[PDB]
């Protein structure tokens, strides 16, 4: 048996009042660990906070929409525990009014639309997004971080290319554009695929 | 007084299945006209069926949203009367499954996005758009069709840009692409203005 670790810890976020944030959290260790987030020592409880499990529990993903302030600015808490440890990772949420957002702040200036694709033909999912510094362009499906499938960019344009398009495909994504003075996402975009 | 005559009459339109189509119609006259759909000389009446004034009623629009085949397939009939007389002109709605729609039936690549603009600045809602004949982009505020306010292209990409933006520009846009194969719509997109 071995006490948890972190694979991948969450990274402070500063979003903008009305959009979305997610926090990040992976741990591995034996037996295999389970996350809970915390905030003040107390486990996070609130209508617009959602948790959504991968990896069989031991990731995790802290999404709160729609964001307020100064309601949801805070440390939080990642912990993974196990039957022979526990061990937590901090990090921080800002939250701008939309009147406070500086010059540079991301753009989603053209997002993701609903798609329907047959099965095994690829689907392209499309995003534009714009900033000060060039925002980097990630992709979230059902509310987690994403050969068959490739992040491309060009220019302004970052593109969700799926080739070999199968069942696991279908559901909501969003593109989320961001820099140095924070994070934006798009609208959600439907994808289905069809026999 | 004279009787109703029509000014905009509304054209046939191929949609898909789960997405919208409005039909636009304007009449002058003496006392101004007023507006009603009907099909098959009953006045149009259903959950998914809108219509919107425009004109200080003299301009309508019907919007189907979602659409569905076959059930929304018909012939509709825009009717203006005053107490001076009443036209008709009909129009003939086509509805697309999406497993049905051919090669060249125009794609929302991606779409306008929810922007805040401060009062007096400009505001730009972008779409790219696709299609076999390459497709028209139009634009619709609120269900309606849309110098202050500029329609351009280039290639792909429409951008509705509205100079000096002003509380009446607040509202919800959507990007229509249209070619000779059917009409498809965006996911609409809300501009606040702030002071
Ligand atoms: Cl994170
Ligand atoms: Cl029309």
């Known amino acids: ?18 959009g979305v944030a997610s926090f990040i959290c992976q741990a591995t260790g034996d037996p295999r660990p389970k996350i809970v987030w915390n905030k003040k020592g107390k486990k996070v409880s ?9 990896d069989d529990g031991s990731g995790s993903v802290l999404r709160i929409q729609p964001l307020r302030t100064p309601r949801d600015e805070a440390i939080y ?5 196990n039957n022979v440890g526990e061990i937590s990772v901090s990090t921080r949420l800002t939250v701008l009014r939309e009147d406070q957002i500086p ?3 991301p753009t989603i200036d053209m997002g993701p639309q609903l798609k329907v694709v047959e099965r095994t033909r690829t689907a392209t999912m499309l995003c534009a997004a714009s900033g000060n510094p060039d925002p980097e ?4 499906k059902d509310f987690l971080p994403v ?4 992040q491309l960019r060009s220019e ?6 799926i080739e070999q398009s199968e069942e696991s495909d279908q559901g909501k994504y969003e593109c989320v554009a961001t820099n140095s003075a ?8 439907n994808l289905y695929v069809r026999g």
Not at 46 to 53: G, M, S, T
Not at 77 to 81: M, Q
């Open 147 to 150: 050969g068959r499938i490739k």
């Open 77 to 81: 808490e990642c912990v993974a525990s």
């Open 182 to 189: 924070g994070t934006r996402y798009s609208a959600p975009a």
């Open 46 to 54: 609130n209508q617009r906070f959602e948790v959504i499990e991968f």
């Open 1 to 18: 048996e071995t006490p948890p670790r972190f694979t991948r810890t969450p990274v402070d976020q500063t979003g903008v009042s009305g």
């Open 137 to 140: 362009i990630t992709w979230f």
């Open 103 to 105: 010059r540079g702040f």
């Open 156 to 161: 302004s344009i970052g593109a969700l290319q």
